[PDB]
Amino acid sequence: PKLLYCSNGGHFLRILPDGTVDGTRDRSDQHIQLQLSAESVGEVYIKSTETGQYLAMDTDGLLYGSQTPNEECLFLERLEENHYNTYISKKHAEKNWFVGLKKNGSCKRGPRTHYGQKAILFLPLP
Numbered sequence: 001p002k003l004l005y006c007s008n009g010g011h012f013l014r015i016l017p018d019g020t021v022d023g024t025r026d027r028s029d030q031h032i033q034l035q036l037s038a039e040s041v042g043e044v045y046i047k048s049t050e051t052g053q054y055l056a057m058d059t060d061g062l063l064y065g066s067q068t069p070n071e072e073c074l075f076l077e078r079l080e081e082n083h084y085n086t087y088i089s090k091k092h093a094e095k096n097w098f099v100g101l102k103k104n105g106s107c108k109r110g111p112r113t114h115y116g117q118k119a120i121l122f123l124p125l126p
Contacts, residue, residue: 004046015031022107034047042078044077080121084123096115098113
C-alpha cells in the first residue's frame with residue numbers, strides 16, 4: 001500500500017468515504033493510504049485501504065471514489081522521468097483524461113488535464 005503525492009500543491013491523493021476525491025497537504029489523514037493492484041501490464045486499480053473505495057472518473061472528467069470496481073476504476077499507469085507516475089482513465093483514454101489535482105488540492109477534471117502539467121504527476125510512496 002502507498003501514498004500518492006501530487007506536485008501540484010503537494011497533496012496526497014485522498015479518497016474520502018463520501019466518495020469525494022481531493023488532495024490534502026496533511027498526512028496521517030487515514031484516507032490517503034492507497035492500494036494499487038495490477039489487472040494487466042500497465043493497468044491499475046486505485047483502492048482506499050480505509051474505505052476500500054476505488055478511484056474512478058465519470059463521463060464528465062470528475063474524479064470520485066467508487067464502492068464497486070468497474071470500467072471507470074481502471075487507469076493506465078506510465079512511469080515518468082522524474083520518478084513520478086501518471087494515471088490515465090482507461091475508459092476515457094482515447095480522449096487523454098488524466099487523474100489530476102489543482103493547487104488547492106481540488107480535483108482537476110480530465111478535459112483540462114494535459115501532459116506537461118504538474119497537476120497530473122504523482123509520486124508512489126510506501
